[PDB]
Design a binder for this molecule. Structure first.
Ligand SMILES: Nc1ncnc2c1ncn2[C@@H]1O[C@H](CSCC[C@H](N)C(=O)O)[C@@H](O)[C@H]1O
Ligand SMILES: Nc1ncnc2c1ncn2[C@@H]1O[C@H](CSCC[C@H](N)C(=O)O)[C@@H](O)[C@H]1O
Ligand SMILES: [Mg+2]
Ligand SMILES: [Mg+2]
Ligand SMILES: [Mg+2]
Ligand SMILES: [Mg+2]
Ligand SMILES: [Mg+2]
Ligand SMILES: [Mg+2]
Lengths: 455, 239, 448, 239
RNA sequence: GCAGUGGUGGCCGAGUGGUUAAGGCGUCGGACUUGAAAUCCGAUUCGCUCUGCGAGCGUGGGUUCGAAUCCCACCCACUGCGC
RNA sequence: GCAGUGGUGGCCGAGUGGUUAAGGCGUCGGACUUGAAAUCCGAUUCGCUCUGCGAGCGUGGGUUCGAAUCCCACCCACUGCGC
């Protein structure tokens, strides 16, 4: 979420800037106006509640002193209460109680309302984002690598069967729509991809981390969105009831790894190479070339995750470094791609900017997104309460770390890209960087052993 | 870049509050008595010499020179009430030799407590750096009216490129040579030209104005560092 | 499930052997008598139902030919169609009653049959106390040496375990595995997959949840409530997370007629397994030893049901596992599990229990089981490709054996290869480890 | 090992049913006419020669030799009704030269259809191998009473180590040299000593008893294999 | 997730309210032929008290004397949409 | 899952119905000393209209004028059981 003081104008805030940003993201403004009025009321209510609490505390202290000195029997002051019998101070305490209760109800309502208005407001935008709402027209292509116009015979939907590495019908009998068995040479290729990606990220300084696949609901709420948490996440139920949700990405448990912590600024750029199986419930088929193992319910993904300093433009340098790491990965794999800057209307709520690596599929004749690199700034760290220093200052407010994430390799989609880009007439040529991790006999070619299902 | 322009206004309007809370949290234990005063200035050396101490703090600058030379009457000025109360509660205090009073050297006027053209020497020891660079000539003019027409004003404060200036992080910078500490008090680092053209614009005459160089060394941490203070003496024109 | 002809004296079977086997497994032997009576009544009911259906079809054929219960073909040929319709109503009432009786008998007949375990192999130790009668069959290595730390301290000393934050994120027993231990687990998976691939196994990555209609045929009722997580989608599906990759691999060939020529089917399952029971029995069972989620590599074989080939393959599977653990340098003994602690499908089970020198105990690392045709006939995986006229089909034999559960094998490696400066890397995993981790996993934290 | 002892009893009690269903599924198309008969045996060569054909099948052994030599009366014996009906529906059939009848050569008796000591030659061509080894002497005695005291019995059937004995899988073995086919009919593979001591135990006299070697070759599959039939002639003692 | 067409035996493929589920293809065994075979004869879903009868055409139901054929639901495909 | 003891601040650790949540330890900044420092002075949970007042001792509640102290529930540990 954003800092609430960005909306308080009595503090150094300015809700007009939040309105401009909420317009550029093509979201609903006026949420800024509702927030400003709710916040301005909450500040006065907080002042009044503090004063009522002070009066109640002073009444209790005076009562304790009267009792321990063995006494014989709301513009109040310290000396003013010092001249009342205990019964009268309790009579006053009852009025204090009524006022405190109604003020507390009003304050809780105002807090909840202001927060549910602050919840929608997206992060501030980096000035490099292309302002638009048409993703198909305004996606800003930044860079291009390789030959992105060559065509080849088969698409991945045929190639996964011609190598005998895919079982779709039996998978759908076992698991249902989209279930699949990966078998034979494609299990070795997936494992080779995992080894290569983990070794690359580990040499760059990332810490490989194998995450749990069940997240609790209390923690998943703080790392996910309303829509995702509603219709995109599977729910797990054990004996009892069951508040667990299968993770949709490893970025969700890794974000909750330093939850509620005061991180030392030294060692602040913590880099994590997450490794897990992801479970997504939305699988829609836009044609034939999106079937096969391209959009599935279950797949392994290697993720980059970085906690960064919020100062000195460090998280944006880190953003460039992460997209560069993924670019060099796919260049060593020899896969052509272009980098696109996503338009304002397509970013989710946490992102200030998002880059995508879209690989060219020569057998399908299309661009398909393989990597997604986001810089969510302190939008999530504030929710998770991951503070930037170990010590809180006297007067200043607490500062939070920035959190970036970027897919390094989703195994099924990268397998599809490798199959389409390395097909020959006799089989799939193995990429030179994966021959270390392949068994003997599978280090030069993955032969075709079945005919094409289309033919 | 620099500190928020809103925050610099809050620093200026809360200068006295920031100095008062400094004396609240630090008491009289932060600064140490200055015994180098008498030696440094050719004045103050060994009749009835009436003196004004602008920005007297909790003492630490007049009590040494006042227990040293016993024929000096002293006026003490400070805009923080806590500092005045500490000066009064000092056991070395006696009304026959001191006249302490609160006076914001930029807003208030000195004639409300001292007689005009009476003081023969006024000291500015690390006091002008706590004043905003655009309200310093206010202080110079406020003290110009109480100085005897042949008297002088003594000044030591931070100079350019001192180590303390060095140390400050970039998030503590208000402007060119203008910083703020963690406690809210500020520090301006003067240059000879700036101070000269600030005293000349209010009717003074320069006598000596030159830097003084020292060093700070902590043997245990083996730290030795350069320090650059600017010492000077300005004199009110006779006629 | 056993062949229902084993309980019918009419066919070449007899329930006395089944009762004596239910006694050897120390289970209930009264199920056999109920099964035999239900089966003998069902055969009569089925005969009567076939005769009623025959009469109905002759009535229909007579009516059809004329438009264009001691009844005979010629007997019906002499009736007015209205008379044939009256006869059809009588036949319909009789068929309704007979079908009610037959469904009841089949229901009870199958209920009593799915609780009779497989026949036993004459090598099985007949007893019920596992701790004394499990025949330690062979020893390998030095199973008496003792070393300083247990795995519960070693996983922290190398900084590869996060239990507290994992329990915050996932709950009791949740864990993050990080750093050097992720590389070691991946090296184990690589080495196991190459070992099994050289032997003729086909690696197979399975789905992690399974439809309930399919999971029933591979698991027991005890497992679903006690051990299977339930996955809920949208609109409230009924899928379950798999407890082992043997469950999806078994369903890979359901309702098939396999060619006897390609009968020695071997698969190396790779998947993540999810268990609910993580009950602890002291400190040495904490850490990553009993968790809810772990990767496992499985052996699954479909075999011919003839010529004792299933038991030869059983020996071959346990030998493959043994060689895997001898090449890693883990000392173990092979144990013949007692008949009391066998699951329903297993007709014999061998566990490989490794010596833990820091814990001072034997821990099970491999479980090898031969379920014969218990699950093949429930899944209808048939041996021949053609059926003979008047001859029942034969089902294949199915065997499964753990090759490597990665968390437990990591625990065994850490406890057996600890030094004063760290953990020595086993000689066979060095090629699958990153540079810098090919001789020693260094200690970087103190022992808790 | 061998076939279940329960199953061997079911095979013995269902011998006639198994042969009947063979003629139902295969009709008269499985076996081919034997034209080698007249040449092989010195009898049957070119007055009124009355003959008994035990196990006549659907013909295939008497119709050739019966259309060849036109002064032969023939008795036909078979325990399968379907085979008898096929023999009768044969267009080459006439009652003046043939007398077909069903008779289980082990249970039934031949005197109920043929006169004693009347037949001058009886043929056993691949018929005794379908009879259980412990009920063969029953057949030999049943036909011993209808043979003229100087007549003989002609016999060709499988011998030891023939290829057909080899092909059979181990799950098709009932005992030493005793197998069962997929259709339920059985095959016993005789040895010279076994047949000799089986005919001698019922009152016969051996004349010739020696193996006949052939093979079988399928050029397209390039299969050439050895075959070992046992041919013999036994004679009823004159006096 | 809608709003259309579909689903036949190991596989292909006919099927028309009264099949023997045709024809192929594949697989499996039996072969006794002297006119042997560069092949012939068969079998090849489940059940029963088996030379026969019963059940089965995605799975369940309905209408009909009778359904593989007509109807409905569900499941799974393919073609268009929503996402 | 029972049937007992427990849960204090970044950490250790006092705490006794009227604290200033003691003492340490760690971390962080400020230093103007001529008698500079082989150190000194401080800060270090949240909130508010900030020299102060309010909230906070696993989390929620109760009793009391007043609870970190007493009671209850839940959660999580440890010790014994069931499994
Ligand atoms: N504008 C102003 N008017 C009056 N006093 C001021 C002032 N600005 C700062 N001060 C005071 O100047 C003092 C500087 S601390 C220095 C005190 C003195 N020079 C000494 O040697 O000890 C502060 O206590 C502050 O209260
Ligand atoms: N015990 C027995 N009594 C009578 N006939 C028998 C018999 N055992 C087998 N058979 C018959 O013998 C026949 C063998 S098939 C051979 C038929 C004949 N020898 C020919 O050359 O064509 C079968 O048809 C069977 O019906
Ligand atoms: Mg078909
Ligand atoms: Mg056909
Ligand atoms: Mg149907
Ligand atoms: Mg603590
Ligand atoms: Mg303290
Ligand atoms: Mg509490």
């Amino acid at each position: 979420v954003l800092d609430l003081d960005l909306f308080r104008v009595d503090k150094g805030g300015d809700p007009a800037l939040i309105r401009e940003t909420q317009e550029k993201r093509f979201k609903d403004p006026g949420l800024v106006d509702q927030l400003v009025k709710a916040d301005s009321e909450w500040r006065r209510c907080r002042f009044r509640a503090d004063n009522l609490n002070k009066l109640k505390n002073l009444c209790s202290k005076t009562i304790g002193e009267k009792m321990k000195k063995k006494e014989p029997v709301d513009d109040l002051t310290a000396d003013a209460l010092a001249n009342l019998k205990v019964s009268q101070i309790k009579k006053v305490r009852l009025l204090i109680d009524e006022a405190i209760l109604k003020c507390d109800a009003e304050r809780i309502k105002l807090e909840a309302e202001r927060f549910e208005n602050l919840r929608e407001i997206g992060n501030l935008l980096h000035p490099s984002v292309p302002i638009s709402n048409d993703e198909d027209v305004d996606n800003k292509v930044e860079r291009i690598w390789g030959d992105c116009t060559v065509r080849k015979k088969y698409s991945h939907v045929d190639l996964v069967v011609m190598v005998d590495g895919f079982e779709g019908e039996k998978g759908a009998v076992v698991a249902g729509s989209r279930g699949y068995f990966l078998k034979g040479v494609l299990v070795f290729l997936e494992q080779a991809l995992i080894q290569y990606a983990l070794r690359t990220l580990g040499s760059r300084g990332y810490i490989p981390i194998y995450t749990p696949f069940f997240m609790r609901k209390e923690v998943m709420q703080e790392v996910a969105q309303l829509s995702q948490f509603d219709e995109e996440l599977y729910k797990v139920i054990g004996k009892g009831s069951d508040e667990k949700y299968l993770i949709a990405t490893s970025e969700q448990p890794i974000a909750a790894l330093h939850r509620d912590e005061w991180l030392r600024p030294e060692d602040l750029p913590i880099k994590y190479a997450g490794l897990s199986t992801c479970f997504r419930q939305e699988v829609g088929s836009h044609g034939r070339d999106t079937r096969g193992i391209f959009r599935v319910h279950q797949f392994e993904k290697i993720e980059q995750f970085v906690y960064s300093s919020p100062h000195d433009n460090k998280s944006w340098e880190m953003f460039e470094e992460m997209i560069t790491t993924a670019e060099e990965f796919y260049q060593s794999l020899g896969i052509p791609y272009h980098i696109v800057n996503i338009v304002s209307g397509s970013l989710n709520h946490a992102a200030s900017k998002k880059l995508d690596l879209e690989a060219w599929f020569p057998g399908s004749g299309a661009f398909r997104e393989l990597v997604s690199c986001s810089n969510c700034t302190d939008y999530q760290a504030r929710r998770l309460r991951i503070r930037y220093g170990q010590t809180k200052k006297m007067m200043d407010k607490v500062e939070f770390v920035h959190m970036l994430n970027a897919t390094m390799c989703a195994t099924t989609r990268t397998i599809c890209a490798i199959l389409e880009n390395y097909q020959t007439e006799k089989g799939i040529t193995v990429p030179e960087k994966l021959k270390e991790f392949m068994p003997p006999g599978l280090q030069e070619l993955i032969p075709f052993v079945k005919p094409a299902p289309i033919e | 870049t620099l500190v928020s322009d809103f925050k610099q206004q809050k620093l200026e309007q809360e200068a006295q509050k920031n100095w008062d809370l400094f004396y609240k949290r630090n008491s009289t234990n932060f600064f140490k008595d200055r015994h180098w005063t008498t030696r440094e200035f050719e004045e103050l050396r060994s009749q009835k010499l009436t003196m004004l101490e602008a920005g007297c703090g909790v003492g630490n600058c007049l009590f040494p020179l006042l227990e040293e030379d016993p024929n000096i009457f002293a006026y003490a000025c400070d805009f923080s009430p806590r500092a005045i109360e500490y000066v009064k509660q000092n056991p070395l205090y006696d009304t026959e030799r001191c006249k302490v009073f609160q006076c914001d050297l930029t807003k208030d006027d000195l004639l409300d407590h001292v007689p005009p053209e009476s003081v023969d020497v006024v000291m500015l020891i690390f006091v002008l750096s706590a004043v905003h660079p655009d309200k310093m000539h206010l202080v110079l003019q406020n003290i110009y009216k109480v100085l005897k027409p042949g008297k002088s004003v003594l000044f030591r404060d931070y100079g350019l490129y001192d180590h303390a200036m060095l140390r400050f992080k970039a998030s503590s910078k208000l402007g060119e040579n203008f910083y703020v500490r963690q406690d809210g008090t500020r520090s301006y680092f003067f240059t000879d030209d700036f101070l000269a053209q600030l005293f000349m614009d209010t009717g003074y005459e320069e006598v000596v104005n030159e830097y003084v160089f020292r060093e700070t060394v902590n043997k245990k941490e083996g730290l030795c560092v350069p320090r650059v203070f600017l010492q000077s003496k300005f004199l009110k024109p006779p006629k």
